[model samples]
Target: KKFALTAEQRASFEKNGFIGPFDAYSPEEMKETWKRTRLRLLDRSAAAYQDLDATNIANYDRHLDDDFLASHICRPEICDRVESILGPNVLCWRTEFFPKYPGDEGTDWHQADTFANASGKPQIIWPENEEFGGTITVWTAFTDANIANGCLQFIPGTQNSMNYDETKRMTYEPDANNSVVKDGVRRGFFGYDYRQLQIDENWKPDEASAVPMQMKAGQFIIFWSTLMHASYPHSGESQEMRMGFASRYVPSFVHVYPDSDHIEEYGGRISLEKYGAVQVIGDETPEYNRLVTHTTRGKKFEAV
Candidate 1:
């Protein structure tokens, strides 16, 4: 009855805090869909937050508006695997689009536990004594992702430990610090330098041992939100840009946006009044957290 991971796969996930570039869609299938979806996303009038900010969070939770994205977030390939790690009952609390255009700088190496690392408040709160504090992130490639196109990089087995403190603040300064090179790689975390929030400011990421995740379009990889993950810079060798869609999941017991109505970070802010966590699988437990079963336009959530 469970879309259970193999014992070995679970072991791997435990040790590495991530697993898979598993098949979610065929190359042609994803290309066909993503092509249209990309164009459709251009018209942002109906998006939850219709304004732009330097931090780019305005693109968050598009599933609540667009039917294609709504269905995409609940695809069985993602939910089944998500259920395996987060138990039977799960909620998809957030979704994001990570796009690296030609000549774009790489993303700074960072790990998030409460996701409070930048947003300045705990977005999703787990129970009183729960061992887990991070969400399971399923990142799917909407375009071909590779070294030249800024594929993701990860420091294996770095999920369980925290090298950065979320309570520490990161100042947003996009204008002056966009392409700064650290350890010979051009990188930055949106408008802030992720290292500013690191527990040890003098310590550097072990780049020699980092692993690059090259994925074909339509594939996905699951990892803890707390994992040491980053991406390469788009080298500009190819004209095509890389796009990744990330869906973040957690167990139903988690209280999402517990103490915040407005999220402020990266020089942008948005009201959570319209935001709701989608119950991708099983029952919801957070009575206070808003739960939506479909998009505002009537696109039903593909829950099971």
Candidate 2:
């Protein structure tokens, strides 16, 4: 059967900037993916972890693997919604596997565009811009995402405006002790004040705010690239796995990168020396009839 997003789903994404729980993957598929991921992690011969700490490095080569790639891009439900927004001829610019193993520290609060800004474009727009458009981030849940395991927490509607100072965006540097430090001090990256970055005084996610995505295996969560989000550190058992794939999609007209050979990641580095882009579909007009909607779940959205 063909997978399609509901009117509600599309509307929620446009307003709040995210939609999720389309469908969970089968148990068998989940098992197989986990198996493959573990194999890739242990394959020291793969060179996937070269020049970077295996404990701290982000795994990009997994997206290049046949089994992982097949499971990531071919999801009919995700591609349908992606095409609906970006039109056909879209490019899967980047893929990252965020594996916060047990005892791993939480990532800092930052916008996806912090890295996208290396392309020299404004990270977030106050009023939605149809010309430059926005990037769609598909966050797939390979395993359960919960509070204990550092599931993501987001500040709804905060993405609509450029909250952080653009000039201050900088790379992340974990100190020798493995704690995140900024500007020669051990503190939060975005000015070290959580209150300064919070959406509002009452804005707080539940202890389980990362909310276990609870997918059987194949299910995924999709959000806007600029949405303000963060996650807690993993405090669960050693084997507790919070695995997911984050694939970034941008309009075909957008410049792929400053240079054709590489794309930027957080901290302003261009990698992808041996990788190529993936065009999921051919040229096609977007279904402009799609309308955006909002939900009553969070603080009511006030259009800027």
Candidate 3:
């Protein structure tokens, strides 16, 4: 309850399907912390997935090894807002680092429901009777985020419906699609073209209504995975790369990795042998969830 959203903030989030560039740390603190954290990240001797190379999937879950990340994911500033949206029992199921170097293409506008666009299998599933599906994502700006530096963009109230179907598989072509121009903008999905997953091949995102989400270092925004979201291309004018750390959350009852022992995506594969969801909020983690409360080296998770 330390950083819970106010009633007005909660109402706005409910209506817009997103909220805040809330400050978790000051800009000065984040810059210094990131400098040290970046160096620590290189020594991934105890990282959960070891066999994979440095690809999109390789950057999956560092919170399981590094002390800073473990605490970042469990910070009251993030957990309290997520709890306000998802209720008491929640889990930090996944985290990934999104880096946009100078001249990197913008991400293709898209929505994720089952997260099977590239993996060809549902990654998370809500309860059978649940009316909606998708996890709450808390995206933190590890560096300054702005239009020229590839900050996120969102179309308000787009969370209630999905524009893309995850069951439809998209082919991987990092080389061919990295900077493909779509609707006059340089955008592409990591490697796969997100347009392949569109429910209507001819339909397109309402870009006219999309709003940019710029934030200072150390700030974070919370939104539904199902919301129409994407980012601008790094223009290179700033001469600095933008880094975003996205930590995904779901209710305790939701399934994580549902029947899969290996994750295959982004032209790479990794074993789930060491993967486990951290119970970052309430303590009602179910028996089905592969739960881990400590780092590989025995650092306890900082949870509410």
Candidate 4:
């Protein structure tokens, strides 16, 4: 049953740029796992970036240090489905933690192709012949993700087109940017205002067509990074924060960090001297990417 995605799911994903809130863990199981994992994450002495400044980038690759995350990235339920979309040979290029505390502002509506809008360099590049450029992101809920607690919202069928130019730059202004209200919602993309990179300053996102994705604690969803996506503000009704762990995958041929040794974004910078893409599929594309035998601390990568 896992050799490929059903024809229907494929068609739907292609058209909508996303599908699923599929179960990856039972709610109780997720709660327990997160309870311990969150505590372990606080100790980042073994993390890849030990000297990075005050930026979320500091937590970019915990999968390299945390045992649960290292195993989570290779989950068959996820890799199997990703293989269906990316065609077998895939690499878990990156993983990020998106957590919204009570009263925290929602993420700004945005799309990323090359992921160059922030760092001013293409983070991921597809083959020259292919016009496509976005990574397939599989985001799992580490805690209950609901509208009241900042669940993700997607503008359906907005993946095939470009609403913002990734080449354009968005300046970092976390304090002032997060305080701005859009229409009536309080949202901002971390430290950067995603709207500033829009191709047309006068144009606006059709928020009227947006749909909220409210998932339970253990469910997971897959979507293209180029999709117009955002989240809701945590209304402070619950003491628990919403945590989403996003694992980004790409085909073996794609370049993880082609020409950059370090990443500069979110008002901080970090070197990539110790960075390497983890191969989850069959084999690594030797000449195309930097592959590591194990994580930074010598934990061998055992893919599902």
List of clashing residue pairs for candidate 3: none
Candidate 3 lDDT over residue span 133-223, tens digit each: 9989999999999999999999999999888989888998888997899988999988889999989999989999999999999999999
Q: How accurate is candidate 2 locally (lDDT)?
A: 0.54
Supply candidate 1's per-residue lDDT for 189.
91
Locate the minimum summed-lDDT window of 10 residues in model 1: 50-59
TM-score of 3: 0.98
- The candidate 2 region of ten consecutive residues with least summed lDDT is 289-298
Give the least accurate 10-residue stretch of model 4, judged by summed lDDT: 295-304
lDDT of 2 by residue, 161-192 (tens): 65544444344443432535433322243213
Q: Could you give the C-alpha RMSD of every candidate to the true structure, in order shown?
A: 1.5, 10.3, 1.2, 1.4
* Index of the highest-TM-score prediction: 3
The residue-by-residue lDDT of candidate 4 on 1-304, one tens digit each, is 3635678988989988998878878999999999999998999888887778658696588888877888888877888888889986889989999999999998989999998989878999888887888999999999989999999999999888889998888888877886479879999888888999899998998899999999998889999999999999999999999999999999988888888888988877888877778888777476758876677667777643
C-alpha positional error of residue 296 in candidate 3 after TM-score superposition, expressed in Å: 1.3
Tens-digit per-residue lDDT, 35-105, candidate 1: 99989888777777755444679668888888778887788877888877888789889999999999999
Off by over 4 Å in 1: 1-3, 51-54
